[PDB]
Structures are given as C-alpha cells and as structure tokens.
Amino acid sequence: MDSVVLFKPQQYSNKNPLGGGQIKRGISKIWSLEMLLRQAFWSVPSGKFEDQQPIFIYLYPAYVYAPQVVEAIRELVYGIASVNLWDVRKHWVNNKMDLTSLKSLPWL
RNA sequence: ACUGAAACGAUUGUUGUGCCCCUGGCGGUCGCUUUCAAUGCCU
DSSP, rough: OOTTSSSSSSSSSHHHHHHHHSSSOOOOHHHHHHHHHHHHHHOOOOSSSSSGGGOOOOOSSOOOHHHHOOOOOOOOTOOOOOHHHHHHHHHTTTTTGGGGGGGOOOOO
C-alpha cells in the first residue's frame, strides 16, 4: 500500500504471476509494521521515500560492544550532523591534508 | 520450472553565437662612364 511502504507498491514483479492482473507486490505483515515504524520514528514520507535516493549506512559491531559503547553509538545515530562536504574539504586542504584533522571536527 | 522461463536507460539534440594578426615603417645612404687621343699624311 501507498500508505504503508516507503517506495512504489505497483511495479513489475518476478514473484507475482507473469501476465496476471496482480500488479501490486506483497509484504509480510511483519515488514508492514516495520515500514510503519520507519514512518513513525524516522519521520520519512510514505510511498515516496525512494525518490530522496536514500542510502543506508549500518554500523555493525566488531562482534562485541560494551554498554558504554552502545550508549556512545546512540548519541551518534540520533545526534549526527547532516554532512556538507564543502567544509570537510576546507578543514583538510587547511591542516595540510593530515587526515587526523577530521578526528576533531564538529560531527554532532 | 536455476531466488526460474522472455528482458535496449531508451528516444531527440551543431560546443554554439561574434571577432581584420592588427597598428607604424623610404631598400636607405655615397658614387664624374672616367682616364689618353692632331682629321692626319702629299698636292
């Protein structure tokens, strides 16, 4: 449904029968709660989020995190600044291309 | 039926339009066609 999923509901499917009138794709009732939780807690559009060209970065652990590191990664993923590459450029041609300069910039 | 069978990111499009290798410039300056010569010899 256009009111549930984050992208076009009605495009060609290899999973629906070929030449059939079932033109809408399927979603598990589980993934239907998940797409609605994404509308609710990321505040993204229904049926139209894909046109924002969304690319997702997932920050998986090196097997284990301590409780303080999961709290640190909370403070990041809910608080990270929307990156603009112009000043990341500026703070790196200044500082003589020492990449260690990036460690200190206001990323939050 | 290989999460299968068939599967064009395609169609159209001028690196375009204007533009003076331009302006100025003495082949110039100096230079004796010169030097020597019996219209001559006899009546």
